């Protein structure tokens, strides 16, 4: 993703859950919906 990082204003870390590492193709099991919008400096994220 990235070579190096410059100054950082903010940093966040989250839960330990694991993700699907393998390449599989068939019925989509799950749906993840996201909305990304930045209003007034705020990066708002919504999901389901």
């Amino acid at each position: 993703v990235y070579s190096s990082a410059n100054n950082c204003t903010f940093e966040y870390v989250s839960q330990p859950f694991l993700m699907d590492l393998e390449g599989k193709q068939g019925n989509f099991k799950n749906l993840r919906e996201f909305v990304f919008k930045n209003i007034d400096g705020y990066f708002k994220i919504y999901s389901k």
Partner: antibody
Amino acid sequence: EVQLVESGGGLVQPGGSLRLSCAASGFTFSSYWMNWVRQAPGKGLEWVANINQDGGEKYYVDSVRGRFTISRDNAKNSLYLQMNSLRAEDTAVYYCARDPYDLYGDYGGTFDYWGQGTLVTVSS
Amino acid sequence: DIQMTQSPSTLSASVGDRVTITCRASQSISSWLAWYQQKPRKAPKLLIYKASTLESGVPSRFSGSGSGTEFTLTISSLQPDDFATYYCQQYNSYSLTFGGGTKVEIKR
């Protein structure tokens, strides 16, 4: 001649396992998804399992999930389906068919080539 | 998931007549439907793909159309060879599903 010959059908008791195999010829086996569909006589045709061209991605119908594993040996040009914990219900004729690419999506062609079928009977 | 329901389950028509079997999906499959022909004990053969594209080598008598959720396979001039059960399938989403099957029989 694109051909698919299935082998391995037989009589099996409940709890038993079998592995059917389908030898393919006439096309580049490595490049295509292969599926196994079964027709159980009173009931209809049912889609059992599918494998991606790479062989990694594998999908199954819920009924079979722990029980059946589909696999393939490209060098061998063979596709296999190992079954476990056979139930009377699994009795059917199993056909190996060459599937289309899922990627095609809204334009899916369906299964172009089919084998003759292997009959497996599960009974005491 | 999606359920495909064909109708009629069985039909009898005379030779040369036009037969129309319909298939109805529980929800929009889009174009993802194909049709198969099956003879007794023989393995199924693919008639149509993408709802209306004829598979190579299949007779021109067979045609398939569809829009929305409802799709139809028509056989313009029924022939004696045509006796069989015809199935629709939707590849749109997993799991793949086939219709109940329509048995066609030659009326005499």
